[PDB]
Structure 1
């Protein structure tokens, strides 16, 4: 039940990013909800079946913390996928520009430049956890949860996607095991690195790594290490250090996501419930 969009109704503004399989542009869309900003993904190239499967999946996935999908454009070439426009771009970039050095990075006119506070970091964390609760409820395995795969809209609205253009400007976040198989090893637990076992339990481990990215203002996990050294540390069971901005109670949540046995990891629903309770308790303080 994929919604179709006339090519005449899409006005491309500029190219945001490019990957091996697609191109993402900022665009204007007419008669969707007159003149609306949207983000358009163009299919570069089998590929048409993957595009069809994705469009169907994105029409079915509907949640306030999953990237909004408006439809496709199958009239002519390239094939297009229309997504919502999220002003603040990807969450990794957003965290890096609203960190301890935000004042140095800020434009002269930027509103109240400075590092995000605890309340804001907990609201970002709780929103990503809510999206992961929804996917787990559908028995859907993301396999590449990371802040680079989240978008931030005006009003600190956070939504999860799966971009693969992430595999271009964030090519350093992937390890090539062979051919075209790019693994986000720094976000993966030992069973995924060793045997490519991806489940809702390997996604909860990645959510723990997302919490660490959030509380370090977007640092790359294991940044001190090469890909082979990070693989060795993870399989040996080394844990990421508690971030300076991370309260001990948030680090206890990360540790719950990082239990060695996948079945011993806390469920994403309990992780979200705990994050939502900490965000509520801090609201007025």
Structure 2
């Protein structure tokens, strides 16, 4: 990390005030705070006693983020490494994680706003892919949302990404977001990230429904292998359901690249009447009245 850390600003602790816990784990917490006017920031700590591996993983996330400069990728402000506890300081996303946000805002956005969120996520992912960065854990829980409704990809690093995520279960993998080839033989590429993006599309258009509902991890893998796919969300544009289905091709070579996804979403947004044509929604319940 010593090479890539030279791109990051070392911040003095007297410039940082922590104010409110917004995330927490065994080895540190994430705070909303202020950075000296003064600007809101998010602050992640690593408490004393950390191991060499933990230090390398922790500062490695900042080192990776410091290499990126894109509207849809969380921005690094700097690090505190010369004092303890060490800290990583980023821009503050006021609306938190996208999955929880949508579940708390059920039905409150237009179809155009939801597709705009997907375009922003896809733009971030195209940037990452072309920068030769494979995310491996793309999911609504790892997208953050600000007060302009801008969605930004977060959660960077090497082994810490899948190790730290409770949704990743023993390889340790978040099964129902992961492409078949990454599950079967550990092949993680930007194309398996495209599979995950298709799941994210479904999460957004359903306002945070849990993919595959109560199917077990094994049931999900069996269903996918036998050709089943997630059904159309309610009120979902046909073009958007078609696009998420193409992300879920078993044959990795047949999936769109993020370049294609960005292009398609941009065209649909720029001609928004195209989003008024809806895919048929198969009701799970029949209600009949004389």
1:78 maps onto 2:82 in alignment: no
Q: Give, in angstroms, the shift of residue 94 of structure 1.
A: 1.4
- Are residues 1:157 and 2:150 paired? yes
Distance 2:206 2:162 in 1: 20
- 2:223 is matched with which residue: 223, 233, 240? 233
Task: Return the alpha-carbon distance in structure 2 between the equivalents of residues 11 and 245 of structure 1.
Answer: 44
Answer yes or no: is the 8 Å Cα contact 2:202–2:233 preserved in 1. Answer: yes
Offset at residue 52 of structure 1 (A): 3.1
Residue among 27, 40, 45 paired with 1:37: 40
Select which of 163, 168, 178 maps to 1:174: 168
CA–CA separation in structure 2 for the residues paired with 1:92 and 1:247? 20
Tell me what 1:13 maps to: 19
Q: How does 1:1-285 map to 2 (within 5 A)?
A: 1-30=7-36, 34-44=37-47, 45=50, 46-100=53-107, 115-162=108-155, 171=166, 173-175=167-169, 177=170, 182-282=172-272
Counterpart-to-counterpart distance in 2, 1:249 and 1:153: 26
Shift of 1:211: 0.4
Q: Where does structure 2 lack aligned partners over 5 or more consecutive residues?
A: 1-6, 277-290
Post-superposition offset of 1:71: 0.8
- Matched residue, 2:4: none
1:189-233 per-residue CA deviation (whole Å, 9 max, x = no partner) reads 111111121001100110111000011101111113122222322
In the alignment, the residues of structure 2 paired with residue 202 and residue 234 of structure 1 have an alpha-carbon distance, to the nearest angstrom, of: 14
Aligned length: 262
CA distance in 2, matches of 1:165, 1:145: 10
The change in CA–CA distance for 1:28 and 1:165 in structure 2 (over 3 A counts) is: farther
Q: Give me the TM-score of the superposition, normalised by structure 2.
A: 0.85
CA distance in 2, matches of 1:36, 1:121: 28
Larger CA deviation: 158-167 vs 6-15? 158-167
User: Which TM-score applies when normalising by structure 1?
Assistant: 0.86
| Structure 1 alignment gaps of length 5 or more | 101-114
